[PDB]
Amino acid sequence: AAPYAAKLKQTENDLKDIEARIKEKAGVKESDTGLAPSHLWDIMGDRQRLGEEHPLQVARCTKIIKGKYVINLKQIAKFVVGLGERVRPKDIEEGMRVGVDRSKYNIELPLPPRIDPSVTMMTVEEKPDVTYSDVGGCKDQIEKLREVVELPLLSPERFATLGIDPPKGILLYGPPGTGKTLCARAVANRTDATFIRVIGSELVQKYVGEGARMVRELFEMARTKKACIIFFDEIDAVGGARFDDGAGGDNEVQRTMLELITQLDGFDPRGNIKVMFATNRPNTLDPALLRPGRIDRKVEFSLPDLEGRANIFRIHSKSMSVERGIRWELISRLCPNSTGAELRSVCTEAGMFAIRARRKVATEKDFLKAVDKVISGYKKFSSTSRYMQYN
Amino acid sequence: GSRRYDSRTTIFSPEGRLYQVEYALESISHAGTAIGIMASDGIVLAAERKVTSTLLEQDTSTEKLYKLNDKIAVAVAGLTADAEILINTARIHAQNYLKTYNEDIPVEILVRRLSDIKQGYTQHGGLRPFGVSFIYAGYDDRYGYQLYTSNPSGNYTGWKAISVGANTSAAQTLLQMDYKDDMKVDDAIELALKTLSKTTDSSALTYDRLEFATIRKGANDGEVYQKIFKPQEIKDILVKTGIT
Amino acid sequence: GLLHLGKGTMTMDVFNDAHVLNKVTLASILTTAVGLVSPSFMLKHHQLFYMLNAGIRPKFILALNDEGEPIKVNVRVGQAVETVGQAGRPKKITGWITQSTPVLLNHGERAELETDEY
Amino acid sequence: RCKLKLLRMERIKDHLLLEEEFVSNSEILKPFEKKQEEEKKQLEEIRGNPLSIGTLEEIIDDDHAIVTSPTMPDYYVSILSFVDKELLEPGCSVLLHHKTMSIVGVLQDDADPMVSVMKMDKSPTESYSDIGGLESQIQEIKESVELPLTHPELYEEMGIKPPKGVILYGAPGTGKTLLAKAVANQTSATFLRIVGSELIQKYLGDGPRLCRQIFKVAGENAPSIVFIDEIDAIGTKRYDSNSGGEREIQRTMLELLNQLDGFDDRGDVKVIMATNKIETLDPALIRPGRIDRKILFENPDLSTKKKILGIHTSKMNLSEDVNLETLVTTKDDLSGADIQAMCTEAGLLALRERRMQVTAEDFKQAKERVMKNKVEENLEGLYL
Amino acid sequence: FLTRSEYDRGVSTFSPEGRLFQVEYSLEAIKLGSTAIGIATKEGVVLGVEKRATSPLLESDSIEKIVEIDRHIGCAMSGLTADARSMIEHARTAAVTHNLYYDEDINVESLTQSVCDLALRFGEGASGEERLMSRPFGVALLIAGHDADDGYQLFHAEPSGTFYRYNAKAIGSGSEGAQAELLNEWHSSLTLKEAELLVLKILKQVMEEKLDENNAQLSCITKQDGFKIYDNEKTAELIKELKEKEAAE
Amino acid sequence: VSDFEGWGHEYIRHLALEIGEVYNDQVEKDAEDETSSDGSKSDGSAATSGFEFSKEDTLRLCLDIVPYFLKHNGEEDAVDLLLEIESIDKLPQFVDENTFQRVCQYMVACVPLLPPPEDVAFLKTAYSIYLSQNELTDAIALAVRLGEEDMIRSVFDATSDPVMHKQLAYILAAQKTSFEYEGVQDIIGNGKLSEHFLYLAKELNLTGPKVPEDIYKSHLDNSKSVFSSAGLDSAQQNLASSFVNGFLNLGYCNDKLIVDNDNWVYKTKGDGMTSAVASIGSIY
Amino acid sequence: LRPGRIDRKIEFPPPSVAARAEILRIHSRKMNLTRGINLRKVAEKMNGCSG
Amino acid sequence: YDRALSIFSPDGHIFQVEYALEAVKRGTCAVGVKGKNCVVLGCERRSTLKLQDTRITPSKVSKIDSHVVLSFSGLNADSRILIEKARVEAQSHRLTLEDPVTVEYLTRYVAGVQQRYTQSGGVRPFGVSTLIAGFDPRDDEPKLYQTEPSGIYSSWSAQTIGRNSKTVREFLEKNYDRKEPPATVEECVKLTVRSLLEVVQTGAKNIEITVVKPDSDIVALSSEEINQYVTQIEQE
Ligand SMILES: Nc1ncnc2c1ncn2[C@@H]1O[C@H](COP(=O)(O)OP(=O)(O)OP(=O)(O)O)[C@@H](O)[C@H]1O
Ligand SMILES: Nc1ncnc2c1ncn2[C@@H]1O[C@H](COP(=O)(O)OP(=O)(O)OP(=O)(O)O)[C@@H](O)[C@H]1O
Ligand SMILES: [Mg+2]
Ligand SMILES: [Mg+2]
């Protein structure tokens, strides 16, 4: 071979060895958090320490006895407790968690109920500023929503002047790519109510009856919350129709399907819980989660018109740098009846053709290519006729 | 009802294709090796029986070789039961042609007619195909000696040397290596026996497991002598070639 | 640029100011920002103020040379691009196909381009 | 060859780094400075001896929390609170005090063996143009995967949102697999790779939690590219039918819609999907704006194979005998994995010899073995 | 693909809709058809079709979708043309039969209705008459004609077995973009040439290639000249005179 | 003959005997046949002719001992022995490009093996090999590396002297010197042109950094201008703000009007004024 | 079995009669036989279909 | 049996026609180009297999009348049925209407033939596509038609079907001219040979050419002839 290979073999293995050695000798570090705006904490940190004032065994009430209480600890171990002098008796309720002394069990500080939910604190969501003007068109279907959901939060006066019961529920349905969830992110901007977002496939667990716990508790936590909205997303699985199999495994799923019914109507009403169901499909749903008194007005969300595509595309191309004198009308005509999510992608693929020609701008030429590009792939793909019949 | 249970076996696959044909071809590679080698002086058809027992009678057995007419014989490989029907249909067609023209059928016509019959079963009716492959040895004056193979699809191809049944590919390579453009019937016999000796599933190749027939221009001035040999003549030519 | 191996001359005022405690006086120095790289554009006898096309390659495969050299594959781009820095430094010439021959090669150099048309 | 000097030069930079590093640690890391001594002192004075790993269920905004320990008993713990009141969140591992349990501190990070499958230590020894050939349908995967990470500046001139997503589809062996692994060497951002046969499980309920996870990790590190190899595997692979079946497959797809785009607003997860069963996917999956430019791959043409075959035989020994052009003649619109299996099997002929020369004979012979594969699961011979 | 359907095992089976599924499918195969536009006035009926080239090697002046039934009835097919091949033969036969029996011109409606009787024969063997089809036809016709008793008529014949008399109708892929315009632009004061240029107008907008006489074809039915297919030269003249009035806006 | 394992290890040993020897001649004080680790001499007409003969053979198809001989001597003489052989081989025995890669691979690779006095002496020969070859584009780059004024003029002369007209040659010369934004080349080439005497107006500018002003304007027009500066009166916060406007207008930008308001210039004080006018300069 | 994923494929046949004697011989070292027993005789009494 | 082998698809199709088209894509490739006074059908034959008798085996171009040729791609077995029906119709025309067929009428007949096994019950379509070419009698216009298993018929200036027809079609856009055919027969032949060598490759023994000239002259050129033509193309 070549007269270096005999020693390239060794020189190269030396590279591999020394990288391991540098890393090993240098050592690593793993933070154990502190704070630079703190350098003294133990002047009365030791009062929280070392001289107990005290951390507490958490328990749960199982029996109020009228004039002591029975708690069963989390260490499963049952004890009889009473009232200290930071407790109020009016403030003990069934199933509430309490703190008791780690030595001689006595209630010191009651505590919020129910430690079993901990994965519903990650479905509580801050409102993304997708803005309320972000939604396409000035069409009227979103104005129906502003009558059911938004306005009674702002003004229950006019509904008190009417005296009607204000409608609470509404169905969001229609084709995808219409921005089903995109108008609900807008409405999350405006109303500034709590949004609690659910995934239907997130409601299915390994063992059955485990998701029954989930749904029930999620609802009651929302009852305590005031001025809240629960956004049922993608509940095509759990949420579907009820039927029998006689040997299925669908039964175990249908349990949590039922759990959704029994909380909506309840034996108590929804106290300012506005409810959205977002379904891709009306083709299969429950007839008691689609009964008209608990989903009150249901709004079909449609495909943009020949005007509606011009409005959406103007929101999109006003956001893009194009060189003036163009038609947003023309591009809508060229398209068949279609989604705006395509219109969101006519701009961006026309922009990849804009960078290809190395324009800072976008012109008519590159728009034409883009319109062809998407249509041709649509034909190559499902849902150019799929609606799964019904209206 | 009945549409319920209908299997639809004559439809295409996503391939554009017919599973039943493929499956028939698969089942014929479970059946015996049949070989046709064309010499310039005749044709050798050599077939290896599938069954062999020291209690089997192999002396009235012509399970693989059949005369369609006294110029055209076949080697049969596949389902025997289906093949029998086609054999008698073939003879009937031969006699029909002889009937209306008073002159012996060319090999062309017969091979094609049978191919059409097979084609009908795959084309329509919901029926399964006839799972047979034929090697036709024939003599006609127009093209002389003719060797043909046809398959359950209803397609035919002429060949200079061909093998069907078990180990098609192996015997084909062998024949490539050992073929001459012109040969004798003796040279052809030798090559045939040898090829079956290297492809036989039992360690030894024996006369009692060989069916062996020729059509020879020994007979002169435009006569051909068919011969379906006796196993005792097969024995002797098996010792000639030195296998036994 | 011509040599990436070369050390600068105008960029040394950027290099200069780290050994000294900060003052308003040093703040005066920093308004200078020279060290600049030209945007390469193809040239002619009448002076063309734009480029035509270029190839750029992020990852070479050659270790028989420290940087390798861009092979004839690169990502193609159009006119009007400043010299691309690290993560884009190997730059190949795209002018061959228009019946033009580069006179001034490119690797990622600062150098301007010039071409000859048949 | 002739790279010995540069490897010695790299090695030499390594010697100098190992040296100065080592001595710096050793004895002149001087902890005789008070901003080291005094900070650790009174940090250890509240910090344990046993540090009692706990699991934080939730926090209360009165400088307290409820922990549940894996040993058992819960506790209503205090917090020393030099640790930044609001820096700890459900799912944390917290250090409790061996006396009265107070949150001494907080561990920053912890991991699963199920995300070990997801994450990677690798650094491919192939970089692009070992995908040499098919070099214009690869501008659709380095102008919407590579480039907006490299330059957002270009997409700022035009403004509006930058690209998102690709689906790769075409024949098997046409490079789909290596395309994904080749952009990941260039970009040097967190490359997750997950097989679709692990997204299909024989247990339900944990299916969705796996799929939900991938993108939550992926958004958590600010740049990531998630390779889902084989999303064609979700309708053809299935175990039992009483914990697999329609149901399992439907849920996981549903989960992926929320994750892929949905309402999460998670971090950057550029997605790459390989598939050749694209019609077993939803219309809300192959919906635009999750696929922006979709790439079609078909078999190369005759002159494209010349590009492919020259890449593969550069690694091999050559002679003047070898002729690449006539190997191309024989093949007719076949995959580049077929070409790649001829060159691999050509050295298997050289291995068989124990002769280290590769010759035109070795390439032609393995050509016949490669064509033996194509037409001998066929039994027609000529098209019936 | 594989749109959810409970019934595709029968060809005459219900359907919690209450209607046949196969018929429904048939009407979704007219949306791939090449656009045929037809304007009916009280002065004649104009049938325009896009001949649809697919290659410049394809000779497109030897293919056409204008098909003569008889001197006083013309017909345009859109959808699946292999099915129309059979139907148009049947219709020609019917017309000749009427003239044999009665020495008289057949009503445009009676003819349309006969072919609708033809369309509904799919089945495995049911009602009093034998089913000689097994799957419904996927092709729709625009039957134009003139009879001396109701004047000019334009009928849309469906693969359903239903027929609607239109005053103008477009079918094919671009049928909706055309029909929106029909609703607005049509009236009963048109003249023959005005309707002719109107056809070329709406054919422009559903044009996926470019308008010229090599992928576009006109034909008329007029009372005293019968059914006449416009040759390509004449068509070219009209296209250019459209371009004159298009640059006058 | 037919590649196999054996010679892939044995043949390296043949070459290594000569290799080791030449290296050992610098380290030792015994030196070639008095060093007994090889017992062979590197001088004579017995082994020195073996090195040269080997070099021709290993050059033709490969590159093995060829780079390696040069540096072990430590002399630029060695590199010049190879110059002769290669410059014949530049076109016919293998392409120009392959040759260019050979030359630069020698210099870039051996840098940590070439202290300053050795390193420059090696780059001279490299310059000569290019000058022999067609690419005068390669010559200029390497001559700047050396830094010798003589060689800058030599590549400039190579295009200039042959032609009695402006041909591509003079445009190309002006470009080659233009590249250095140091401008040591620029001054040198401007005065060769006056001597040669063709058009002055285009050529001297093009050698100089004048034309580079022109193209910056073409690029600026595409880029645009942005102003986003703060401004508040009276303190270090005012001093900061007025500096910031130029810090956003680095390179040639258009901000004529902002400069024209001399108010804020005066509202900085002391040294602040100095740095305020200084940031105005960076706008242009 | 797609291209380049599998590159060596090893078929195993049922045993020969020489190979079947060779397995028998290994087993006889565990046992205590009598002299004069041929294991090529035993391998011919067998025909096997597997090891 | 009267049960359907044709089920309507909600896609706007029938699955079996799609599957048929695929079947026709797997078939050997045929090219058709008409000159000004000739027609040329070139066809690939797989003679890669050895010890094949080719004398007695019919070429993949079948004469259906004394002036009308048919070439095919797709299922070889199936095609023979179409071929018999067509020869029969050819004689019928002379019998009842007198004067050999015209290319168009015969094309129309074949179109109806393949169509019928779609629309009927108890039958599946043919996966076969034909190139029908020839002359009308008393005429000298070459007429080249293509029928496809959809039961749809077409006229073409030039056309190609079979395996990898797209490559050759692109070639034909660029080497055949809608305005001008190559006027000499030989040049036409060589244009089609040059076309065939795109995909067919691997020597000049797999190429077959039939040339038809009006006045009922159908002749097929043997391998020797082709060898000469090919080598000329090769040298140039
Ligand atoms: N009406 C609209 N106006 C403007 N933009 C829209 C609209 N609808 C959709 N979009 C754009 O398309 C993107 C994606 O659509 P989105 O994900 O909201 O679909 P979806 O309706 O939730 O469908 P699915 O839930 O079935 O997948 C949005 O982020 C937005 O950019
Ligand atoms: N167009 C090409 N250019 C360069 N190399 C190629 C090309 N196509 C294939 N190869 C080589 O063939 C290889 C085998 O490819 P790989 O296993 O990545 O193929 P694949 O298409 O991903 O296979 P599968 O169809 O099984 O998904 C690659 O690793 C690659 O080096
Ligand atoms: Mg949604
Ligand atoms: Mg793969």
The CA distance from F3 to the nearest CA of chain A, in Å, is 10
CA-based nearest residue to D155, from B226, C69, A318, A356: A356
CA pair distance D174, E108, nearest whole angstrom: 58
Alpha carbon H18 to its chain centroid, in Å, reads: 20
- Widest CA span in chain F: 87
D33 with F94: CB under 8 angstroms? no
Distance A302 CA to ligand 3 centre (A): 14
Q: Tokens 């505590």: give the residue.
A: A111
Indicate the domain borders of chain E. Answer: 8-249
* First-last CA distance in chain F: 69
CA-based nearest residue to D57, from D81, D86, D92: D92
List all residues of chain D from 309 to 368 with a beta carbon under 8 Å from chain C.
Answer: none
Give whole-number Cα distances, H202 to D363, D372, H163, in Å.
17, 18, 16
Nearest to B179 among H51, H80, H124 (CB): H51
F62 with F54: CB under 8 angstroms? no
Q: Is the CB of A274 under 6 A from ligand 1?
A: no
CA pair distance E168, E158, nearest whole angstrom: 15
CA-based nearest residue to D379, from F71, B153, A226: B153
- Name the DSSP letter for residue D202: S
Contact G7 D370 (CB under 8 A): no
Any bridge partners for residue A297, and if so which?
Answer: A170
Residues in Cβ contact with C57 at an 8 Å cutoff, skipping those fewer than 6 apart = C70, C71, C73, C74, C75, C90, C91, C92
Residues in Cβ contact with A247 at an 8 Å cutoff, skipping those fewer than 6 apart = none
Q: Tokens for D368?
A: 């016949």
Q: Is the CB of D260 under 6 A from ligand 2?
A: no
Nearest residue (by CA) to ligand 1, atom 10, is A179
E92 with E118: CB under 8 angstroms? no
Q: Give the nearest chain B residue to D375 (CA atoms).
A: B169
Residues in Cβ contact with C52 at an 8 Å cutoff, skipping those fewer than 6 apart = C42, C79, C94, C95, C98, C100, C115
Contact H199 D382 (CB under 8 A): no
Contact B157 H57 (CB under 8 A): yes
Domains of chain H: 1-236 (3.60.20.10)
Write down the number of H helices and E strands in chain D: 12, 10
Contacts of D347 in chain F (CB under 8 A): none
Any bridge partners for residue B35, and if so which?
Answer: B46, B163
CA pair distance A381, A176, nearest whole angstrom: 14
CA-based nearest residue to B106, from B135, B69, B155, B161: B69
E95 with E111: CB under 8 angstroms? yes
Q: Topology of domain E8-249, per CATH?
A: Glutamine Phosphoribosylpyrophosphate, subunit 1, domain 1 (3.60.20)
* D167 reaches A (C-beta below 8 A): no
- Pairing status of strand E66-70 against strand A273-279: unpaired
- Name the DSSP letter for residue F250: -
What is the per-residue DSSP string for C24-87? Answer: HHHHHHTT------PPP----TT---S---EEE-S-----SSSS----TT-EEE-S--PPP-SS
Nearest residue (by CA) to ligand 1, atom 26, is A176
Q: Tokens for G35?
A: 């002299």
The CA distance from C81 to the nearest CA of chain A, in Å, is 9
List all residues of chain F from 58 to 117 with a beta carbon under 8 Å from chain D.
Answer: 63, 67, 105, 109-113
H77 with B119: CB under 8 angstroms? yes
Q: Is the CB of A141 under 6 A from ligand 1?
A: no
E181 with E205: CB under 8 angstroms? yes
Query: B228 — phi, psi (to 5°)?
Result: -100, 110
Q: Tokens for F161?
A: 């002297």
CA pair distance A383, A341, nearest whole angstrom: 14
* DSSP H helical ranges for chain A: 5-26, 45-48, 141-145, 151-154, 157-162, 182-191, 210-224, 250-264, 308-317, 328-334, 340-356, 364-379
CA pair distance A335, A342, nearest whole angstrom: 10
Nearest to H76 among D332, D333, D384 (CB): D384
Nearest residue (by CA) to ligand 1, atom 3, is A136
CA-based nearest residue to B74, from B156, B154, B138: B138
Q: Is E229 exposed, middle or buried (0-12, 13-18, 19+ CB in 10 A)?
A: middle
Q: What is the CA radius of gyration of chain H?
A: 18
Q: Do F and C touch (≥3 CB pairs < 8 Å)?
A: yes
CA pair distance D109, B135, nearest whole angstrom: 76
Nearest residue (by CA) to ligand 2, atom 14, is D337
Q: What is the CA radius of gyration of chain E?
A: 19
CA pair distance A184, F229, nearest whole angstrom: 38
Q: Is the CB of D299 under 6 A from ligand 2?
A: no
CA pair distance E199, A225, nearest whole angstrom: 64
Nearest residue (by CA) to ligand 2, atom 1, is D133
The CA distance from E13 to the nearest CA of chain B, in Å, is 13
Task: Show which subunits contact F, needing at least 3 CB pairs below 8 angstroms.
Answer: A, C, D
CA pair distance F192, F181, nearest whole angstrom: 19
CA pair distance G41, G21, nearest whole angstrom: 9
Contact E4 A385 (CB under 8 A): no
Atom of ligand 2 nearest to the CA of D126: 31
CA pair distance H159, H31, nearest whole angstrom: 6
Give whole-number Cα distances, D365 to B176, D357, D361, F27, in Å.
18, 15, 6, 54
CA pair distance F260, D87, nearest whole angstrom: 51
CA pair distance F183, F178, nearest whole angstrom: 7
Contact D376 B157 (CB under 8 A): no
User: Considering its fold, how many domains does chain B have in total?
Assistant: 1
- Name the DSSP letter for residue E187: -
User: SS3 helix, strand, coil % of chain E, rounded to 5?
Assistant: 35, 25, 45
Crossing angle of helices F136-146 and F149-160, in 10° steps, is 160
Residue to probe by mutation, ligand 1, list D256, D261, D286, most atoms within 8 Å of CB = D261
To test the contact with chain A by mutation, choose from D7, D76, D166 the residue with the greatest count of A C-beta atoms within 10 A, namely D76
CA pair distance B82, B92, nearest whole angstrom: 16
CA pair distance A385, A360, nearest whole angstrom: 38
Contacts of B119 in chain H (CB under 8 A): 77-78, 80-81
Query: A106 — phi, psi (to 5°)?
Result: -155, 140
D65 with D59: CB under 8 angstroms? yes
- Pairing status of strand D190-195 against strand D223-229: parallel
Contact D341 G8 (CB under 8 A): no
Any bridge partners for residue B74, and if so which?
Answer: B66, B136
Query: H132 — phi, psi (to 5°)?
Result: -110, 125
CA pair distance D273, D164, nearest whole angstrom: 12
Question: Residue F225 is which amino acid?
Answer: S
Query: E86 — phi, psi (to 5°)?
Result: -70, -45
Tell me the residue range of the domain where B58 lies.
1-244
Crossing angle of helices B80-101 and B107-123, in 10° steps, is 130
For every residue of D39-74, which 3-state class applies, written as one string? Answer: HHCCCCCCCCCCCCEEEEEEEECCCEEEEECCCCCE
**In 3-state terms, what secondary structure has residue B48?**
strand
**In 3-state terms, what secondary structure has residue B37?**
strand
Q: Is the CB of D196 under 6 A from ligand 2?
A: no
Crossing angle of helices H76-96 and B107-123, in 10° steps, is 110
Nearest to A42 among D2, D11, D42 (CB): D42
- Pairing status of strand A228-233 against strand A273-279: parallel
CATH code (residue B222): 3.60.20.10
F125-156 CB burial, b ≥16 within 10 A, e <16: bbbbbbbebeebbbbbbbbbbbeeeebbbbbb
Say how many C-beta atoms besides its own lie within 10 A of residue F119's C-beta: 16
* First-last CA distance in chain A: 76
Residue to probe by mutation, ligand 2, list D125, D131, D344, most atoms within 8 Å of CB = D131
**Cα torsion A380, A383, A389, B3: sign:** positive
D361 membership: H or E segment, kind and range: helix D360-375
Contact C79 A358 (CB under 8 A): yes
Alpha carbon D291 to its chain centroid, in Å, reads: 18
D343 with D363: CB under 8 angstroms? yes
A71 membership: H or E segment, kind and range: strand A69-72
* A336 reaches D (C-beta below 8 A): no
Residues in Cβ contact with A273 at an 8 Å cutoff, skipping those fewer than 6 apart = A168, A222, A223, A228, A229, A230
What's chain B's length in residues? 244
Chain breaks in chain C (C to N over 2.5 A) after: none
Nearest residue (by CA) to ligand 1, atom 23, is A176
Q: Is A139 exposed, middle or buried (0-12, 13-18, 19+ CB in 10 A)?
A: middle
Distance H11 CA to ligand 1 centre (A): 27
Q: Tokens for E157?
A: 């014949």
Contact A357 C78 (CB under 8 A): yes
Contact D344 G4 (CB under 8 A): yes
Contact A356 C81 (CB under 8 A): no
* DSSP H helical ranges for B73-230: 80-101, 107-123, 168-178, 185-199
Nearest to D5 among F2, F8, F113 (CB): F113
To test the contact with chain C by mutation, choose from A4, A358, A366 the residue with the greatest count of C C-beta atoms within 10 A, namely A358
What is the per-residue DSSP string for A258-275? Answer: HHHHHHHS-SS--SSEEE
CA-based nearest residue to E171, from E69, E61, E84, E90: E84
Q: Give the nearest chain A residue to H11 (CA atoms).
A: A385
Q: Is the CB of A312 under 6 A from ligand 1?
A: yes
Q: Tokens for A230?
A: 């629960």
Q: Is the CB of A346 under 6 A from ligand 1?
A: no
CA pair distance E103, E100, nearest whole angstrom: 6
